[PDB]
Swiss-Prot record, chains A, B:
This is Fluoroacetyl-CoA thioesterase. Homodimer. Pfam families: FlK (PF22636). The active site is at A38, E46, H72. Hydrolyzes fluoroacetyl-CoA before it can react with citrate synthase, and thus confers fluoroacetate resistance. Cannot use acetyl-CoA as substrate. Its EC number is 3.1.2.29. It catalyses: fluoroacetyl-CoA + H2O = fluoroacetate + CoA + H(+). CoA binds at G65, H72, T73. Substrate binds at F36, A37, A38, G39, F40, M41, V42, G43, L44, M45, E46, G65, R116. Changing H72A: Reduced activity. The keyword Hydrolase applies.
Length: 133, 133
């Protein structure tokens, strides 16, 4: 992977990615404005970095997010396209660090950093299963 | 609202809050281990803080998350209870900050900070309408 390379991921926000859809179990979030949820924006930043990393993993490997540190500076109604730009900051062993940004065609809506760790999917799955009640 | 006061929120993780469920749109996430998604954890931490701050709201008001900065230090399969602890760090006018931390009864699973802004619901909604395609 090359540090400083930018990757973009575009995503038309559908009606089902607003706040209330993140937790249909939450009465608070049921009155919230119909805008893209910060937890969906975080998933979309992860998705961008997963796609960027994919060509570089060995077969059987995946990754997990290990930190996210971002602002959310404008809100985005469904129908706009959120573009995430991910730029690789460093790779050290299994750890990849990213500078991430997102824009909805109107406003910058968020920026910060994200870190991930490469994992062996099958081994990690087995470990999760052993944690599972 | 008192700085240093803690609020806690418990959540049993159901099967439908795993990674593949955050973006069923995403073939990239399709075959991921069945663990609580970071975007869902982010939503839970926001939810914890929304609940902590409900007494601060005037009628007509709501809040928006404006930053999240957390680590994810362990993964949580469905069936475990995630407890989020939201410790108020600052409250100044429209702006509130918490230290958030989460544990799944087995492991510490992440911590960091979350910031929110009080909003006037009707005004905000008008602003969102004016950028709705």
């Amino acid at each position: 992977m090359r540090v400083g390379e930018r990757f973009t991921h575009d995503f038309v926000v559908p009606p089902h990615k607003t706040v209330r859809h993140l937790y249909p179990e939450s009465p608070e979030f049921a009155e919230f404005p119909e805008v893209f949820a910060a937890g969906f924006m975080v998933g979309l930043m992860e998705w961008a970095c997963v796609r960027a990393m994919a060509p570089y993993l060995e077969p059987g490997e995946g990754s997990l997010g290990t930190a996210i540190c971002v602002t959310h500076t404008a809100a985005t109604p469904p129908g706009l396209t959120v573009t995430v730009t991910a730029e690789l900051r460093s790779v050290e062993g299994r750890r990849l660090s990213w500078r991430v940004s997102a824009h909805d065609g109107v406003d910058e809506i968020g920026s910060g950093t994200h870190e991930r760790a490469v994992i062996h999917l099958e081994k990690f799955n087995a470990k999760v299963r052993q944690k599972t009640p």
